[PDB]
Amino acid sequence: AQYEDGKQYTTLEKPVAGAPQVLEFFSFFCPHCYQFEEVLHISDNVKKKLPEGVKMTKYHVNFMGGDLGKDLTQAWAVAMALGVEDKVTVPLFEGVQKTQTIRSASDIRDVFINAGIKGEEYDAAWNSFVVKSLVAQQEKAAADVQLRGVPAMFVNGKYQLNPQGMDTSNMDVFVQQYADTVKYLSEK
């Protein structure tokens, strides 16, 4: 066929029940993730092609960057709880990978402050059980699929995108193949 299991995607031989429809994992320490977000704009092009009645989910992971990796998973929970993902994603990626000015939880906090989140509001969220449970969700979703690498995308808890099987000569063509593959898997 044109889309073949083991080529543009793989099937999980243990499917995950009740999973989010489109579920993407990343790390602010992850070099391809930086490309995916700032250069390729994957999440965004996928969304533009998804049918509707299908919502998109993105989670941070712990297994890169040790202690700071964990802080970032908690900060991303704060971002989700406050609905400020689209204001902190770029400065967090650049702070970790470009300027390398993020070295502590306080440095992560500064990014939110600079993005206009008030200090008390950030700290309140950081310490809240709603954020604790949101951290728990991120961990559980990753555990459910035995996640050992990012970037990663899963459709309906049964299919895993396989970008290694796509031409990268042209960055735009790669992105559409990626997005079109997600749509195909979505309609399966």
Side-chain angles (χ1 to χ4, degrees):
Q2 294 280 353
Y3 295 103
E4 291 180 340
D5 182 352
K7 191 40 184 252
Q8 296 104 323
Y9 68 99
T10 51
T11 308
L12 302 176
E13 55 182 289
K14 324 191 43 167
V16 173
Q21 284 158 299
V22 179
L23 176 59
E24 182 179 341
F25 297 96
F26 79 110
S27 172
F28 286 115
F29 280 96
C30 159
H32 286 114
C33 303
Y34 187 107
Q35 290 302 298
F36 264 45
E37 180 63 19
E38 293 215 10
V39 180
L40 302 185
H41 307 281
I42 296 292
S43 301
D44 203 86
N45 281 274
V46 171
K47 162 178 201 155
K48 286 190 299 80
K49 281 199 177 165
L50 286 183
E52 289 124 320
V54 61
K55 136 204 189 183
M56 210 146 162
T57 304
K58 173 145 65 194
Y59 289 159
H60 197 270
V61 301
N62 289 341
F63 59 80
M64 300 185 80
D67 213 281
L68 253 192
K70 284 212 80 159
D71 277 329
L72 285 165
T73 299
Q74 191 161 350
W76 187 249
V78 177
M80 283 186 296
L82 299 180
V84 297
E85 301 94 321
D86 291 338
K87 303 167 168 201
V88 300
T89 293
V90 166
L92 287 173
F93 265 121
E94 303 200 333
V96 180
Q97 296 187 48
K98 185 190 186 170
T99 62
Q100 288 180 356
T101 50
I102 294 180
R103 309 178 233 93
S104 69
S106 180
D107 298 338
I108 298 167
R109 179 173 185 281
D110 287 348
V111 171
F112 285 68
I113 298 305
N114 194 44
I117 288 84
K118 286 306 190 161
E120 90 214 68
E121 191 191 359
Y122 182 88
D123 300 334
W126 180 269
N127 288 306
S128 69
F129 288 88
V130 164
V131 161
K132 298 205 194 304
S133 93
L134 230 39
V135 168
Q137 292 165 228
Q138 293 181 89
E139 298 190 17
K140 181 180 175 278
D144 286 347
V145 298
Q146 198 162 285
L147 187 70
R148 84 208 161 179
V150 283
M153 189 173 303
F154 296 87
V155 181
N156 292 318
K158 322 123 166 169
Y159 305 103
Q160 187 184 330
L161 276 286
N162 188 43
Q164 77 170 10
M166 307 182 189
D167 201 330
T168 61
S169 62
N170 176 296
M171 327 191 84
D172 304 310
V173 169
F174 168 71
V175 175
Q176 288 329 314
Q177 176 171 19
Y178 195 99
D180 290 345
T181 301
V182 178
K183 180 173 183 284
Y184 157 74
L185 291 172
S186 204
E187 289 156 5
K188 218 163 170 79

